[PDB]
């Protein structure tokens, strides 16, 4: 009862569009439909609404994030360095 062996979420596309494109869109589609744990209230009730907007179903707060992920590696690195940079500069 696995119904597949490798296709996964990209099984709706049947036999169209070519193997490599189907396999390559899976990377973003699987993480876009997922569900993440909130940061303000702690519940696991965060889902995507628009192309860059995320919102918690329980506290009703809304946050601007990545395109297909609640956060992106580039943004996280910048915040850490900037926080480190500011503290030493003001000390």
């Amino acid at each position: 009862s696995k119904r597949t062996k490798k296709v996964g979420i990209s099984g709706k596309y049947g036999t169209r569009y070519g193997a490599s494109l189907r396999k390559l869109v899976k990377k973003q589609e699987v993480t876009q439909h997922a569900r993440y744990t909130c940061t303000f209230c702690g519940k696991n009730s965060v889902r995507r609404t628009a192309v860059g907007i995320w919102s918690c179903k329980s506290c009703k707060k809304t946050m601007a994030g990545g395109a297909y992920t609640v956060s992106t590696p580039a943004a996280a690195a910048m915040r850490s360095t900037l926080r480190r940079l500011r503290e030493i500069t003001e000390a």
Binding site: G52, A67, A74, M78, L82, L85, R86, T89
Partner: protein, 51 residues
């Protein structure tokens, strides 16, 4: 104001001339970087997302 900022920070929606209300980097996922200052005859050099 971009003069009260140390070198290395990334910003967005920069004004090409003070008051034009934002012209430089304002698309999805891009930024500009400051490189160095000039306290005398105040002027700042920046790097744009195209190089």
């Amino acid at each position: 104001p971009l003069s009260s900022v140390p070198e290395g920070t990334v910003v967005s929606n920069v004004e090409e001339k003070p008051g034009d209300r934002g012209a430089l980097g304002r698309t999805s996922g891009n930024y500009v970087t400051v490189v160095g200052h000039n306290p005398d005859e105040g002027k700042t050099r920046i790097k744009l997302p195209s190089g």
